[PDB]
Structure 1
Amino acid sequence: MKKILDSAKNYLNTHDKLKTACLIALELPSSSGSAATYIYLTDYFRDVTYNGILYRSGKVKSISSHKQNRQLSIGSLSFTITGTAEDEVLKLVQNGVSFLDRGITIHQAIINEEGNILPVDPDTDGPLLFFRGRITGGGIKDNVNTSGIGTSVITWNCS
């Protein structure tokens, strides 16, 4: 079992209100190997500057659950993106196949009473890693109705 820093356990026991944030560092496709770019996202309500990396907060809506058991198998995780964003709708629609097999690193970060991140993981004194792997496909579902409020959700799939 992965032990966590002592102060982490003390904060988790003492504080009943936890302001968690999921920090996503998604790999961005490049035509040639000479380029390497990442897009950083979070579901928190403000940008989180973690290790000098600015995790913007506008887009990510929800994240699925990570599950594993005693038998080796390729676990999967899917997170949703707001389909009203023009950047991501364009990216998924017109580049959603070139995104295959591109990495992603999701961190589960507790935000202190101040904006600092509670150092739970003792190996890096940072957040506790939540997921890591590669994308496998995507999907957008535009859903409008002539009466009411429509919907547009971008769903990514990962392994």
Structure 2
Amino acid sequence: MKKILDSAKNYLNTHDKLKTACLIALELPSSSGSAATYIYLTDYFRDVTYNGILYRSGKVKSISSHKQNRQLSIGSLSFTITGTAEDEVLKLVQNGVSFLDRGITIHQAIINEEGNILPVDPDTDGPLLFFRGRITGGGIKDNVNTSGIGTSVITWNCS
């Protein structure tokens, strides 16, 4: 029971072609201890900006499904950030960092014609939260087949 607002109810009932966008506010794996530095990724295509930060839109190919039944079950997701982005893979495989903590918040923003249609009644009328969890993640899978296309995806696990 998230009240979802009557405006969002009407939009979901009528519009029938809604451009879903996810707002991933990652917290960077940081070493030696400092203030938290956040990378703001989104799936969409343009650059969807919610309440300040711009949420860059050049990564995160897909997001897993949030499967959680009536049993506390370490509810887990998994990003898929392209492994051809030097910055992300570098932050992944740098030796010295530890990221036991570091929140991941995903906002599943229902894009309006021009910029988010104001659901979530208690919160400032923005998108529903989607995960709001912690990052306990894996890493690269490279293929570089000699025949042709190979894939490379960062599988950021989070639970």
Same fold (TM over 0.5): yes
Distance 1:88 1:38, change over 3 A: same
Deviation at 1:148, TM superposition (A): 1.2
> Is 1:135 matched up with 2:132?
no
Deviation at 1:121, TM superposition (A): 4.1
Deviation at 1:29, TM superposition (A): 3.5
Equivalent pairs: percent with the same residue?
100
Distance 1:95 1:103, change over 3 A: farther
Q: Deviations over 1:43-89 (max 9, x none)?
A: 01011110011100001110000122212221111111000100011
Q: Distance in 1 between matches of 2:6 and 2:26?
A: 30
Deviation at 1:123, TM superposition (A): 3.1
* Paired residue total: 159
Counterpart contact for 1:97–1:137, Cα < 8 Å? no
Which protein is richer in strand relative to its size? 1
Q: Which structure 2 segments of 5+ residues have no match? A: none
Deviation at 1:145, TM superposition (A): 1.3
Aligned pairs (5 A) from 1:4-83: 4-31=4-31, 34-83=34-83
Q: Distance in 2 between matches of 1:119 and 1:69?
A: 25
Alignment TM-score, normalising by the size of structure 2: 0.91
Q: Which structure 1 segments of 5+ residues have no match? A: none
**How much is the aligned-residue C-alpha RMSD, in angstroms?**
1.8
Alignment TM-score, normalising by the size of structure 1: 0.91
Q: Deviations over 1:23-57 (max 9, x none)?
A: 00011234455422110000010111100111000
Q: Distance in 1 between matches of 2:50 and 2:143?
A: 36
Deviation at 1:117, TM superposition (A): 4.2
Q: Deviations over 1:109-156 (max 9, x none)?
A: 101012344434443211111101111132101101111111111101
Deviation at 1:93, TM superposition (A): 1.4
